[PDB]
């Protein structure tokens, strides 16, 4: 308790991670005010699983995790339990029994550029699907054919990551959105993250 | 089994046009987002365009917007990339892509634009 939880450091970070290299911040030993985030004018998505979003301040958890990254607007719906697609399968995966909330907002004026922003990447090729909450930052050449690649990008030898090329004149579904996933963890230890009072 | 086959590439003069096609098998094109990428030797793979039937239906890389148009013929299960006002910087192998439980990308079609 005592001090309010440092959610501002997560939501107001100037730089956000690429989804393949998604960031995680642990939140503990603090008073969490979720209602002020939910009630704000700030987000276009605030969707919860296993909890009611309007009673978040009434709840207590052992730890909270805050994962953050940038993806396309029309990819935000892959950030949910039970989804498939290149993001849910190769980049960031939620478990079926996810308890938590997914928060997103359009970041076109920060993360798109005239001429294209190439800084944000996603994984386009992978041998198998990620486990829930798994991260893969490898850049091994993906062997698509029968011939081995020996670390050289080339014919049937794919570099596994891809730049989004976010550019501001596409419709919102292809504009960048910043995403924060709050995972609510309840172990067999006392709760250290509760709402106010 | 899912397959994509790109056609239509060739050698063109700058300012000319080409119509690329992506013939899809194993899934309905209207049920999946389909994308064009391009890559020149020794250069990074570049996202070119996308088409789907929900949310924002089409999108383009900044440098091809206004010159390229992506479209879809459900009956022929094919996606097209009409490329107008071609420039030497458009020279590349062009690939069609879909995600159907996993990533699928074609063998590509070569586009060369002389100055």
């Amino acid at each position: 308790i005592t001090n309010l939880c440092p959610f501002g450091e997560v939501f107001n970070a100037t730089r956000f991670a690429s989804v393949y290299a998604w960031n995680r911040k642990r939140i503990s030993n603090c008073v969490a005010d979720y209602s002020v985030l939910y009630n704000s004018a700030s987000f276009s998505t605030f969707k919860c699983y296993g909890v009611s979003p309007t009673k978040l301040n009434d709840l207590c958890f052992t730890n909270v995790y805050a994962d953050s990254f940038v993806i396309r607007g029309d990819e935000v719906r892959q950030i949910a339990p039970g989804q498939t697609g290149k993001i849910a399968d190769y980049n960031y995966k939620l478990p079926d029994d996810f308890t938590g909330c997914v928060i997103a907002w359009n970041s076109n004026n920060l993360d798109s550029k005239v001429g294209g922003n190439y800084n944000y990447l996603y994984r386009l090729f992978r041998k198998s699907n990620l486990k829930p909450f798994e991260r893969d930052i490898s850049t091994e050449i993906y062997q698509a054919g029968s011939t081995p690649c020996n670390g050289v990008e080339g014919f049937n030898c794919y570099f596994p990551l891809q730049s989004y090329g976010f550019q501001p004149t596409n419709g919102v579904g292809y504009q960048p959105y910043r995403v924060v996933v709050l995972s609510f963890e309840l172990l067999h230890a006392p709760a250290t993250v509760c709402g106010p009072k | 089994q899912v397959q994509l086959v790109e056609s239509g590439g060739g050698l063109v003069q700058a300012g000319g046009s080409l119509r690329l096609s992506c013939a899809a098998s194993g899934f309905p094109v209207q049920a999946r987002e389909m994308e064009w990428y391009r890559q020149a030797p020794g250069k990074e793979r570049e996202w070119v365009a996308a088409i789907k039937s929900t949310g924002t239906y089409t999108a383009y890389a900044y440098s091809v917007k206004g010159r390229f148009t992506i479209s879809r013929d459900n009956a022929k299960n094919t996606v097209y990339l009409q490329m107008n006002s071609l420039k030497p910087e458009d020279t590349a192998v062009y690939y069609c892509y879909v995600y159907v439980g996993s990533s699928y990308i074609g063998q590509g079609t070569q586009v060369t634009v002389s100055a």
Partner: nanobody
Amino acid sequence: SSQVQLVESGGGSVQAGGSLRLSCAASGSISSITYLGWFRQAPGKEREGVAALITVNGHTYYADSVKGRFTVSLDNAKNTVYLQMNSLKPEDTALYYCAAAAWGYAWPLHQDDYWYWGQGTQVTVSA
């Protein structure tokens, strides 16, 4: 399911430039409703979001095509949400659905999220 029940009314036929007002009355587990959406669908086309309202604060969202013409509002006393449709045009012709959600809010609307659905009311705008 039937946890939240939505009944629409107010649709009909109008000439281009006219106005309509759709109503959607909610019953059942109404305290759980976090979000009210108006969708529309013409046959063979996408069921697309038109407008939405967040119940905790009354914040509203509108599709670009209807901004300045449509207004969504909520009467909490009657538990009824309204879509006022002004300056109608043939392009607005569709079956309009009211929908209610309890998991928070998400804009743009997507019909594959878990929604409680009204039965739909037809709007037909003639040139």
